[PDB]
Amino acid sequence: VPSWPQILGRLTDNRDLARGQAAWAMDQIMTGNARPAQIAAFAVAMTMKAPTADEVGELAGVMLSHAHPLPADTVPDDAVDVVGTGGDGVNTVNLSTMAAIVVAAAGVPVVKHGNRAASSLSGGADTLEALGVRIDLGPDLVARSLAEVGIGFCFAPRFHPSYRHAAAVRREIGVPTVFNLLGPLTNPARPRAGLIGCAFADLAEVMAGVFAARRSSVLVVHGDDGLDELTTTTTSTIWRVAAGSVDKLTFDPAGFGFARAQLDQLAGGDAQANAAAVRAVLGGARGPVRDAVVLNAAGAIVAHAGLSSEWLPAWEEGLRRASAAIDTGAAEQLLARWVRFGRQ
Amino acid sequence: SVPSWPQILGRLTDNRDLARGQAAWAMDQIMTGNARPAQIAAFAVAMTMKAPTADEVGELAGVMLSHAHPLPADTVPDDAVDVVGTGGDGVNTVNLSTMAAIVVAAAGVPVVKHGNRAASSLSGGADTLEALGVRIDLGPDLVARSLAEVGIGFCFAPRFHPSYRHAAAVRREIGVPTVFNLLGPLTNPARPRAGLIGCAFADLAEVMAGVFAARRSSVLVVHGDDGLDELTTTTTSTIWRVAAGSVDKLTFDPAGFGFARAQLDQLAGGDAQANAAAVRAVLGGARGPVRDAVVLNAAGAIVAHAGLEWLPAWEEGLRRASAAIDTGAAEQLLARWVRFGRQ
Ligand SMILES: O=P(O)(O)OC[C@H]1O[C@H](OP(=O)(O)OP(=O)(O)O)[C@H](O)[C@@H]1O
Ligand SMILES: O=P(O)(O)OC[C@H]1O[C@H](OP(=O)(O)OP(=O)(O)O)[C@H](O)[C@@H]1O
Ligand SMILES: [Mn+2]
Ligand SMILES: [Mn+2]
Ligand SMILES: [Mn+2]
Ligand SMILES: [Mn+2]
């Protein structure tokens, strides 16, 4: 029978867990039956042991079993996510949130998982909130947002109430652990595609492994400068997940005509500063930030195409649609229509 | 930089040895109620899986000792010895350290024993002593009087380390052994300079030895090659011998002193009442495998005391230990120990 001394002892002995043990642990944590000390011990122990795809898969599986689902037949089968682990410690503009809006305006259904900042000044949820977008909608209203606007936002705490004990321990110990991976892996709407950012180069492959087990079409991205984003300051490492297999690639924006940028050119601020930065990009303003948004939006579109079916043509078409979605004003319009939807 | 949990924990998760003072900072935060249980647990686990260094463990123990209740000045003889282990060998044996401690004290060697109740066994040293009528929870002044009048004193770790309670609680909750399990033997409040120190975790005995070496203590850190945190009689033992601030590892065979091979079955104990009866049995002069184990461990502590020639030291240790029992001195010392607590 499973117990904490058994599982913790196994992890501290640097052993992989038996099937079901990670699942048992997470379920204890989600049902409020685990002491903070046990939660912390488990989180740390698994991280230093080096999590397997199976183990992390079991953790996310439990979370999704307890998560508030969206109503049946309300999420298109080709819906995409654009979200990162966060915690790169750079405080950039909200590239995922900006990319998600552009991708939606390009005609790709987007059901975005998100959350407030943890280590940054303003996270996606914070910036969206500052734009007038509603980040408090339940399953039904998110479904309506998807249908009517083309984009929905699932605020993780709203859909994962049982995760509050784990989230508290994350806050207390501060150090990143395997828990930092679970957000991007537990979109309640369960889209089968997405552009997933990972700040931790050593854990990106594991994330990709989990998505692969689900037969998802995902690009797990880690900027070689440390961003949990497709960066423009240098190359990016992409773990391409397609047909249940992971393929490690290095991506260079220069190969698609993009100039190198400095990190301070992508720097952000508070929610109001970042909101203004969203408006600028969608407004047609050229520069480093636009390039970053277009590239990331294109990545999400590449991930989308990996569902129904190569690499260079997909990116070239992705870059086209993302740029066009901005230049026609569609992305700017979608945001406006999104804000109005909430007030209605 | 600014000391913080994200910093230190982050360093441990990255599998880097800590900088000087960081381990001390962490332990001090824990020892002052300024650490959340989650932070306590994260640190304990992280410090364990990285693999703690002698420097780091030394800082943890140091902080504990800098907070602990000390014994009054000039109450602890300079040649006082300790007999204690980390516990957690998994084998429910009789209480060899406590029994040896009584024998050693009866032989004339001052013993100030550190100790605690059971954590995973059916009965710890403190539990068995309590069942014998010995007062275990005495404060500094009375432990000093005990040491003077009786020739032995017992420091109950919860009594002398009240600020360790938060760490102790967390250890209880997570169950798994951590670096904290090493601290007990390393934090005797009376700070005896010699001792026989048991370590259940073979891979960490050298670390414990390094800590004692840093204090230039005369210590034998023992790990039975059958898993016991004791000098065993079922097979050979690993001894990390600490003398002159230097550690030297070696294999020890009690057969070289005439001791027959025993089996773990013969050293098995039970609850406090059973183990207490086992103590009375040995001190009564009963021959058998239990007596051999006690005399062996008692001798080791005497050898450690002497460290303040290897073979002759053991021969005199085994001789003095056997005599302390057979003369009835060890039995009498226990009885006198009980009367002290009752007056
Ligand atoms: O504070 P951090 O730990 O650094 O994380 C920053 C944000 O990144 C994650 O979401 P998201 O991918 O949507 O962020 P983004 O839109 O800004 O790119 C996370 O939910 C945070 O909101
Ligand atoms: O339950 P455990 O975790 O296994 O530990 C058993 C005992 O060992 C330690 O003391 P001590 O060295 O005095 O033990 P002993 O007298 O029985 O030999 C510890 O303080 C416990 O009292
Ligand atoms: Mn992001
Ligand atoms: Mn980011
Ligand atoms: Mn012992
Ligand atoms: Mn023992």
PDB file of C-alpha atoms and ligand atoms in Angstrom, chain A residues 82-99 112-128 153 170 180 184 195 197 228-229 274, ligand 1:
ATOM      1  CA  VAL A  82       0.127  29.215 -26.083  1.00  0.00           C
ATOM      2  CA  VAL A  83       1.591  29.211 -22.572  1.00  0.00           C
ATOM      3  CA  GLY A  84       4.866  28.852 -20.685  1.00  0.00           C
ATOM      4  CA  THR A  85       6.162  27.626 -17.356  1.00  0.00           C
ATOM      5  CA  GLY A  86       7.354  31.139 -16.633  1.00  0.00           C
ATOM      6  CA  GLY A  87      10.270  31.689 -14.278  1.00  0.00           C
ATOM      7  CA  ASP A  88      12.948  32.694 -16.780  1.00  0.00           C
ATOM      8  CA  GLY A  89      13.619  35.667 -14.497  1.00  0.00           C
ATOM      9  CA  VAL A  90      13.911  38.245 -17.291  1.00  0.00           C
ATOM     10  CA  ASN A  91      10.616  40.162 -17.044  1.00  0.00           C
ATOM     11  CA  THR A  92       9.837  40.436 -20.751  1.00  0.00           C
ATOM     12  CA  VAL A  93       6.682  41.483 -22.558  1.00  0.00           C
ATOM     13  CA  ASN A  94       3.919  38.875 -22.556  1.00  0.00           C
ATOM     14  CA  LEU A  95       4.860  37.038 -25.739  1.00  0.00           C
ATOM     15  CA  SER A  96       2.508  34.077 -25.282  1.00  0.00           C
ATOM     16  CA  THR A  97      -0.518  36.269 -24.612  1.00  0.00           C
ATOM     17  CA  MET A  98       0.299  38.467 -27.598  1.00  0.00           C
ATOM     18  CA  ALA A  99       0.994  35.440 -29.777  1.00  0.00           C
ATOM     19  CA  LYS A 112      -5.324  29.641 -23.583  1.00  0.00           C
ATOM     20  CA  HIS A 113      -4.307  28.358 -20.176  1.00  0.00           C
ATOM     21  CA  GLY A 114      -2.864  31.056 -17.953  1.00  0.00           C
ATOM     22  CA  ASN A 115      -2.122  32.431 -14.522  1.00  0.00           C
ATOM     23  CA  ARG A 116      -0.898  35.524 -12.706  1.00  0.00           C
ATOM     24  CA  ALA A 117       2.793  36.327 -12.303  1.00  0.00           C
ATOM     25  CA  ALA A 118       4.921  34.403  -9.811  1.00  0.00           C
ATOM     26  CA  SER A 119       8.401  35.885 -10.245  1.00  0.00           C
ATOM     27  CA  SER A 120       7.637  38.463 -12.955  1.00  0.00           C
ATOM     28  CA  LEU A 121       6.069  41.916 -12.719  1.00  0.00           C
ATOM     29  CA  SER A 122       3.055  41.039 -14.871  1.00  0.00           C
ATOM     30  CA  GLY A 123       1.996  37.634 -16.150  1.00  0.00           C
ATOM     31  CA  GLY A 124      -0.440  36.894 -18.954  1.00  0.00           C
ATOM     32  CA  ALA A 125      -3.509  36.995 -16.722  1.00  0.00           C
ATOM     33  CA  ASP A 126      -2.380  40.291 -15.181  1.00  0.00           C
ATOM     34  CA  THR A 127      -1.845  41.927 -18.570  1.00  0.00           C
ATOM     35  CA  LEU A 128      -5.098  40.565 -20.005  1.00  0.00           C
ATOM     36  CA  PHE A 153      -8.861  32.071 -21.422  1.00  0.00           C
ATOM     37  CA  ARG A 170       5.411  26.393  -4.357  1.00  0.00           C
ATOM     38  CA  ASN A 180       6.450  24.495 -12.272  1.00  0.00           C
ATOM     39  CA  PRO A 184       1.278  24.215 -19.208  1.00  0.00           C
ATOM     40  CA  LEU A 195       3.380  26.278 -28.341  1.00  0.00           C
ATOM     41  CA  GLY A 197       7.435  27.444 -23.209  1.00  0.00           C
ATOM     42  CA  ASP A 228      10.511  30.187 -21.902  1.00  0.00           C
ATOM     43  CA  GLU A 229       9.735  31.605 -25.339  1.00  0.00           C
ATOM     44  CA  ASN A 274       2.691  45.489 -20.763  1.00  0.00           C
TER      45      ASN A 274
HETATM   46  O1  LIG C   1       6.157  35.171 -13.307  1.00  0.00           O
HETATM   47  P1  LIG C   1       6.625  34.087 -14.209  1.00  0.00           P
HETATM   48  O2  LIG C   1       7.002  32.971 -13.299  1.00  0.00           O
HETATM   49  O3  LIG C   1       7.907  34.574 -14.746  1.00  0.00           O
HETATM   50  O4  LIG C   1       5.575  33.680 -15.325  1.00  0.00           O
HETATM   51  C1  LIG C   1       5.155  34.656 -16.241  1.00  0.00           C
HETATM   52  C2  LIG C   1       3.885  34.219 -16.940  1.00  0.00           C
HETATM   53  O5  LIG C   1       4.170  33.155 -17.878  1.00  0.00           O
HETATM   54  C3  LIG C   1       3.114  32.144 -17.713  1.00  0.00           C
HETATM   55  O6  LIG C   1       2.017  32.394 -18.506  1.00  0.00           O
HETATM   56  P2  LIG C   1       2.156  32.952 -19.988  1.00  0.00           P
HETATM   57  O7  LIG C   1       2.776  31.940 -20.895  1.00  0.00           O
HETATM   58  O8  LIG C   1       0.828  33.145 -20.600  1.00  0.00           O
HETATM   59  O9  LIG C   1       2.978  34.313 -19.947  1.00  0.00           O
HETATM   60  P3  LIG C   1       3.178  35.390 -21.091  1.00  0.00           P
HETATM   61  O10 LIG C   1       1.970  35.792 -21.834  1.00  0.00           O
HETATM   62  O11 LIG C   1       3.705  36.640 -20.500  1.00  0.00           O
HETATM   63  O12 LIG C   1       4.162  35.050 -22.134  1.00  0.00           O
HETATM   64  C4  LIG C   1       2.701  32.257 -16.320  1.00  0.00           C
HETATM   65  O13 LIG C   1       1.332  31.882 -16.189  1.00  0.00           O
HETATM   66  C5  LIG C   1       2.887  33.689 -15.985  1.00  0.00           C
HETATM   67  O14 LIG C   1       1.650  34.375 -16.144  1.00  0.00           O
END
